[PDB]
Design a protein around this nucleic acid. Sequence first.
DNA 1: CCACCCCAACA
DNA 2: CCACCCCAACA
DNA 3: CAAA
DNA 4: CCACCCCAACA
DNA 5: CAAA
DNA 6: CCACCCCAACA
Lengths: 49, 549
Amino acid sequence: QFFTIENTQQITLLRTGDEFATGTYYFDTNPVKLTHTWQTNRQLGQPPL
Amino acid sequence: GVGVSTGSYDNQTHYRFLGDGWVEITALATRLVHLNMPKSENYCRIRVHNTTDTSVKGNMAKDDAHEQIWTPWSLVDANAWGVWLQPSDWQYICNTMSQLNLVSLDQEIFNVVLKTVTEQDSGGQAIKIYNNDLTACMMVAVDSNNILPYTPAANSMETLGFYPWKPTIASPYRYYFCVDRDLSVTYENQEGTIEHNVMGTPKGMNSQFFTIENTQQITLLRTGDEFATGTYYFDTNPVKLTHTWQTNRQLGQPPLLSTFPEADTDAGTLTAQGSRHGATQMEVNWVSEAIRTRPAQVGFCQPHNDFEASRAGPFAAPKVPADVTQGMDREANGSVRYSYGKQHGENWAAHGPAPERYTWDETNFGSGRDTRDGFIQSAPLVVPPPLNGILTNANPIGTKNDIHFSNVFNSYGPLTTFSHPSPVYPQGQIWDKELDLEHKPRLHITAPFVCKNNAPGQMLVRLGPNLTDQYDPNGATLSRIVTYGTFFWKGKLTMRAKLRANTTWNPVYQVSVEDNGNSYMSVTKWLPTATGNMQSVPLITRPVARNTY
DNA sequence: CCACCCCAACA
DNA sequence: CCACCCCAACA
DNA sequence: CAAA
DNA sequence: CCACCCCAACA
DNA sequence: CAAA
DNA sequence: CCACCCCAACA
């Protein structure tokens, strides 16, 4: 699987007074919880009476 | 104020026959409850460290050391089957309906009674007079915001009476607290010592101390006060009231019969194995009913009697239910196990503080796995497998005799299937929250239905502190009047299910009640006695095939 | 606020 | 008059 | 179910 | 004139 | 896919 | 002026 940038992707020959900029890439990923747990298996349910 | 009632009494079971075998089962129940005064009006962080079953050497599966927290609040759980149905109903249900679901749930409380007792009678033998306090309270807290932990009381068989004409009691709310432990293994007598058996100080990291009188609202109920919740709609997956039996040897086109019997007592015969057409995933030249490529892996081989560890350390590792093969591995195919008291079974006329259970052995046959036929070959799958080219159930592992490889095996390939843990009429649970883990179990063993979203809010009940003439909080122990109370409770539980078809030819098994023998299924078992005791015996729900493949 | 062993002589 | 550890399944 |  | 073991992917 |  | 190995998240 031999690729070539100068074959697959476009090249924007930037000089000095040239500005290259991309668009706003929107993400479609699942959130991340900034919380930690500690409920083992011995710590899930009704404690003994 | 006082005089008129607040509620009714419905322990009825209403049926509705909709269009297209879409039945609607609305169950009700109004249990009368007794709730006494909490010993403490404090919050306690109590610990237990049984160093009498912990300081042995083999007694590991006896570790009962946990750091608990007691709440003056008394909980109310109705997340059971027995409370919502009768022996008949279930029979009509499980026996007729195919599948089943869970809809609404509307709890209600009324006709609150509050009385006081004055130990009197010194000018005699001793008598406790009982009178009312028409000014008293009964804090009711409904935690739906599910802020507090989830303690399915059905866990420790602490629910509401099953006998709708028998006063029951609540369950004092207590929840788990972070500690930390370390316990080492050891066999029978072993030598040396255990080393360390330590608890765990506050892990000012995992600490999670809550207060009902801080997180949840309290509706100070008097006598003429009625507390009632809204109709909680459920968003759970249905449950199939059908059982399977299609193993791996019973999925696809049976071999071609080139020879047929000529009269009862003379079976047929297939054609030359290594001449038989078909596929296989084994490099040999002869298709068998064991070699042959199937769709998937019916049931999986789980390590039985594990025993894993962590911070509170042990703990057995569950099993997803599966028959108990003709060898009754009963401990592998993780068949369960219950132990209930009168107020949930028992010969409501027995003695000795001795519980009673009924080992549940799933029906999801053709799924289970027999540990008395293990079996694993090597490279060139030479059929007449030598010895040094196999690993059976008797072949030691680790250097331990009675310690086999089936005890460690784990065949849970992306080619595995299996049925959901079926309900369990009496006792058995109903619904259960869901571990707030990024990733989650495919199922819970502890209950057929698992709300996909939030869950019902727990309903916590407490007596309100009734005070005396004296009370300086700078008082070590404070005086309070002996106060207790009755309230009724009513329940709406709604389910909607389908009516089964009848696709076979052969009748099929069902649930029935035989004459009076000695057989498990025999009336007397249910109907009361001279006096009036009453059993409840867990019954089967799923008696009926389902052609898996 | 009693109808033909349930919901419901339904509404 | 119970919805995803608060107000608030908001109104 | 974390956005909508 | 093939839809989730019936009528019936109904009309 | 068990409701809709 | 970044969308799922091309033109092209097309216009």
